[PDB]
């Protein structure tokens, strides 16, 4: 009746270029000012879309209706600059590193964003190490 | 030394949410709108970085370094609309159909954004008919 075809490697491959327009701040559309405790500010430009594709979190806040017509700029208290970052990290490859400290924080900004695959690995690290 | 974790699910399900965003038009930001022979107009929606994501045409033509500031309109002439459709659908999903007579017009369409995935898949279905 009809020829069709998937691609099983296309959204590793895809995101990998989504990665790569964020480092190079191409087609950015929300810069994530935090700030926290004394440790200045850091800004994150991403992909308010990819940001949503992850994060229920994300969604909600950016899809409300309203328009962009250019930056919007998130003021995020409350998480440390390296974990908003290793965060970004996961929506955009899916993986995520950390020491043994920093991995109790790490599950705080992620329940906070309801990254749940996440809160769950970390989760699971805490106790395998009591 | 350090803790570290790869969901290999994530792109899978994140451009699941990614194809919903575009079903509801939220967080959009180009409409090709397509016209074609004598057939009317169509608009899609869809958001510049996905299409970037999968098409080295789309990315050029959306990372040149101007600004959105609003939605761009780009006009799409020189395809069917429902060549368009299905590869916006690619794009979204990674997986394409089709029947046997469009299966030339698809493509085209591919060679012409350098969708190269679907550009291989359709050589081979003509061949394979051949």
């Given at each position: 009746?009809?020829?069709?075809?998937?691609?099983?490697?296309?959204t590793?491959?895809?995101?990998?270029?989504?990665?790569?327009?964020r480092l190079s701040q191409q087609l950015c559309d929300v810069t994530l000012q935090v700030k926290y405790e004394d440790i200045p500010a850091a800004q994150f430009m991403?992909?308010?879309?990819?940001?949503?594709?992850?994060?229920?979190?994300?969604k909600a806040m950016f899809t409300n209706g309203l328009r962009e017509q250019g930056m919007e700029v998130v003021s995020i208290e409350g998480i440390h600059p390296k974990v908003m970052e290793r965060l970004i990290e996961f929506a955009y490859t899916a993986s995520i590193s950390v020491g043994e400290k920093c991995v109790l924080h790490v599950?705080?900004?992620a329940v906070m964003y309801?990254?749940?695959?996440?809160?769950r690995a970390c989760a699971d690290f805490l106790v395998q190490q009591l």
């Open positions: 009746r009809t020829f069709s075809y998937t691609l099983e490697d296309h590793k491959q895809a995101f990998g270029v989504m990665n790569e327009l991403a992909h308010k879309v990819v940001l949503a594709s992850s994060s229920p979190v994300f599950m705080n900004g309801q990254i749940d695959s996440v809160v």
